[PDB]
Amino acid sequence: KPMFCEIIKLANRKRLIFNTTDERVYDARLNYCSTADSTVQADCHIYWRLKLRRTDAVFEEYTGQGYSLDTAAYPQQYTDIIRGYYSKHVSSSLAANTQHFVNVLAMLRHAGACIAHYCMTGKIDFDILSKKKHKNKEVVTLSNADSLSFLPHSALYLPSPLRASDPEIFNMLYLLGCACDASIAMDNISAKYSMPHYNPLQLSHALHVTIFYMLSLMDSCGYGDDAVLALTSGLHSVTTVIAHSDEGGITRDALRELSYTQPYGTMPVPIAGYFQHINVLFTTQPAWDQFAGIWDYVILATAALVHLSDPGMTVNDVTYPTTLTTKVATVDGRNSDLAAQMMHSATRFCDIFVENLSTFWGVVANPDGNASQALLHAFNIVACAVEPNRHLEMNVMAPWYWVESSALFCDYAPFRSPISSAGYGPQCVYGARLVLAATNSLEFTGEAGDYSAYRFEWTTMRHNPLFNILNKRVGDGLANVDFRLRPFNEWLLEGQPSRRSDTLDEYIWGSTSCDLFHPAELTSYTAVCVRFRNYLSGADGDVRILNTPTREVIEGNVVTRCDGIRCLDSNKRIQHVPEVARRYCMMARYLAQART
Amino acid sequence: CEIIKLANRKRLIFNTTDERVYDARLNYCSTADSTVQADCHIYWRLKLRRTDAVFEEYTGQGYSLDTAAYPQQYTDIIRGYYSKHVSSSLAANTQHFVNVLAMLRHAGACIAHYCMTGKIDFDILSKKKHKNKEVVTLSNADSLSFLPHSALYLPSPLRASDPEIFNMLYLLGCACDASIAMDNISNTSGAAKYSMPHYNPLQLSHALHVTIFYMLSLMDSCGYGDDAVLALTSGLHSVTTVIAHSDEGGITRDALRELSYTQPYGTMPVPILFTTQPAWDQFAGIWDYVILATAALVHLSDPGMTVNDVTYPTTLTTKVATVDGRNSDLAAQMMHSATRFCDIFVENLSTFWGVVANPDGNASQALLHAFNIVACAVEPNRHLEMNVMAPWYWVESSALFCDYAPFRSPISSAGYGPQCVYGARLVLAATNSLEFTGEAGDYSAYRFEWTTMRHNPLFNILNKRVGDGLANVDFRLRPFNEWLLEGQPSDTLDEYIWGSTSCDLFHPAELTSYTAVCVRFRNYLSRILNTPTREVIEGNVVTRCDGIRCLDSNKRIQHVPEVARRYCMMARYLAQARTFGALTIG
């Protein structure tokens, strides 16, 4: 069964996106409460941003060159369903070991483009679905499918029992065949096939049920990974989830670069109950609201799978998220060595990402890697390219974080990832209270006359959500936290390079887009000494207590809860992006001579 | 009970300027001398927050209640409902949950708007969005579709047993946006549009009244009864503005206004005090008693400061100057005081509504988070402009309860709290511990072991008698003894009391001096005055309530008293006790 926990559907979207300039925002609130005292609490706002890349992004030139799956034969029961489609004279004497190979990934990609276009703007009709190529489509006419062998090209065969079972799947597969350069073969017509007029409600329902039909069709052949990869590539081909880190988003470009050849095959009448249920209530003729909500949710969830699932490098026995550092300087937005490092990390990213993309959907992962190698080749196309890339003009990158997966999945344990076990990944589970560690394992070294010193291992800021709570305080939150006990102020992925050609508020990312920290933000590989300012001693001679958490708050865990999720218009605060120092440093030199 | 229900009011309020003033007449009389006595009028002012106060925008961002499981009988009824209809059978095996807290907040909001304004139709109940609201239909559901865990499911036997509660739960689901899922919708106007019969406001008010207590009984069966009544009172105070007796001290009102909840979900089984469709008067009386009883409850549930093993009301103290009308150092102390206050106020709200509170006390966590929202936000707030406060007095609790026994109060163990019980006579001490310092020409000096003005109620009698009120009584100010929360900036005792016209009673921490004070009376004027004798000063005072009468706005009571809140020497004593230890003030 697929997982569709209805998170984005409850946001109740009102406005329609018609141009590239505006964007749709979904914000969640996470409440952070220290278990030691309930005074120390904060509300972190997570803003996901969605934007339509182009008005005519669906209407794009179909090249027809790309990944092709020429070995996708049916199992025994479907082959029985297909031999039920021949003539009775032919079906009485036909080989049981016959194989009807099928490719439908290009129609999955186009239907993903049409369905995310319907999420972005309320318009959909036969004009969008066929890419203006149903006006002059000439379907060939044959009887009983014994004459299918007569056709020289491999033909998209749409039988008459599929039409007599339910006509909306037949009509929608004819429309998606008209979208691609497929040769369509039918049984009966009444020269050109004429389908009944659909309102966009039934048309969106037909688009929905054919998406799940084609996913069931490919999972029946075992090649469900290619199906869900083609559907994710189709979803991100017309929409653009705006990246949380300016670094990330190369995975979005790899999903944009995926293209497929001309579809072909025979479409059986589907077996009853291949999918048990899709754990969300969906109806015939749904509104734009609920349909756009459920499918915006699957867009954001398959965007969150890249942060939720990635291979973490083990640097000196303690796990860190993959951080790729080059020595050569960047020329014209290009880095060859950094590209080689992201290929070395993508060869292990692609397997676990296609397995968890399958695990997100209803399909099981093919143990033979087919979507993973095609996605790796999509990375190989988007790198080593002559065009300048915005996502590579840097010397330090941390690729797999593209959007935050904190409060977007109701359940996290079916997804496999070592990074979620390493302390990163899900920060707050929706619908539950998540009690996790406040800071790194520490030792109270000493207390000065007006400060208090602690020694952290400092894996990364994301193991320290307590500084989230200190971030959202309007006063005395991070100005009191300062770093002067450590001898060298060397940090990989510095907070703000603009100030320096020292307090934790001075070097930290802006983070106005999302209050939670990047999993490699302000990372270090050595132990750090932090000191807090508990009191304030004036010049005249009096002291006053500042709003600094006490000692037992630091060893006392943090309960995280999730508040509601709503929809907003864009404003300047979320549009602001942090300036990040991405260059070779002393901690990068420690990373080079580390264990890794 | 019915303390304000018997009282009859006919004034209808349609704007935020007009207000409804409840008056309680109080007789204070000494036990030793009957001829010295006084009538104190205490006034409650209720008004509209805004005209569009019930139409405030529902965010969806708010407190999220979890683990709100049903008892075994309800789960059996719900599993019968799910096994009855198709595409619901898989949802029977899991433990079912519920959340109607946003529905209860809007329910309290719209009944407060009905009890204040007096007009209700479907546009007001559902925030005029019911006319465009698609109801998902399980009969029209797809074969792949599944009844999920966060859609509000309204069964057809709920419509069969009691369609008034069914329709009202539908309207409150339209108000606080959710996925309303019914079994089948009659396609007479729209395919999924649910058309409704027209109700006169009496039947609609009765249906809303019974469905509020229906949801309260449901959440009480589920175990979370305190959070349900907390959301209900949050909506009630969210619409009705109750003007505080102490000026600039209604922070709890703004904390209840900053509450919000997540979007409601669950399923509504068949259930396991008027019966008729009432007039506006009786319904408004019982719910205005609910509102003013919670406004008394916020006073009755107050943790106490311990200063040299003496119990005082929680009074808070900063030193830093105000910026943008707010003090963060004051706000942090208010958060600590609220941390104790929420645990004590939720227990008292549970004892008021008759529901048992959960042991973890997450409703107190929601209220404390509301205090964190109102305390750590950037707006020009009138309430936090000051330096020194007594936060947790909002409305005087005297003569609002038949008894004060089940309320667990750590401040009414001392002399603080209600001065009179309604329908009863309450005898209490007129003065503190005393000694007779002496008597001279035309004056008589008593050494008062001074704690506060509320421990010395007798002076209000001296204020409210005819002739001169408290002009004869004055102080001898030594250098050690210093006042806090004074009456006016610029030695008679009338200059030191606030002169609050909203209520004749004194504020808890009206005038606090940790040390003893010397008070001299003027017995003779050189004739003889009406100053009481020594047995009247040391003798007790009985307190009684005599009727409650409603009235319109008076310009006398609308004037707020002056407190002269500034950083003082006693504030420095409290600061030194806070940061250097308690032994520095011993």
Numbering used by the authors:
A (entry chain A): 15 to 204, 210 to 520, 541 to 635
B (entry chain B): 19 to 290, 300 to 517, 541 to 576, 583 to 642
Authors' text:
The structure of the virus-like particle of LRV1 was determined to a resolution of 3.65 Å using cryo-electron microscopy and single-particle reconstruction. The capsid is spherical in shape, with an outer diameter of 424 Å. The particle is built from 120 copies of capsid protein organized with icosahedral symmetry. The two capsid proteins forming the icosahedral asymmetric unit of LRV1 differ in their structures, despite being identical in their amino acid sequences. The structure of subunit A could be built for residues 15 to 204, 210 to 520, and 541 to 635 out of 742, whereas that of subunit B was determined for residues 19 to 290, 300 to 517, 541 to 576, and 583 to 642. The two subunits have a similar distribution of secondary structure elements and can be divided into the α-domain, which is formed by α-helices 1 to 13 and 16, and the β-domain, which contains β-strands A-L and α-helices 14 and 15. Structural differences between A and B subunits in the LRV1 capsid, which reflect their nonequivalent interactions with the remainder of the capsid, are located primarily at protein-protein interfaces. The largest interface in the LRV1 capsid between subunits A and B has a buried surface area of 2,000 Å2, whereas the remaining interfaces are smaller than 1,200 Å2. The capsids of LRV1 contain pores with a diameter of 10 Å along the 5-fold axes. The surface of the LRV1 capsid is negatively charged except for the positively charged cleft in each capsid protein.
The species of Leishmania carrying Leishmania RNA virus 1 (LRV1), from the family Totiviridae, are more likely to cause severe disease and are less sensitive to treatment than those that do not contain the virus. LRVs belong to the family Totiviridae of viruses with linear double-stranded RNA (dsRNA) genomes. Totiviruses have nonenveloped, spherical capsids with icosahedral symmetry formed by 120 copies of a capsid protein assembled in asymmetric dimers. To protect viral RNAs from degradation, capsid proteins of the L-A totivirus cleave the 5′ caps of host mRNAs, creating decoys to overload the cellular RNA quality control system.
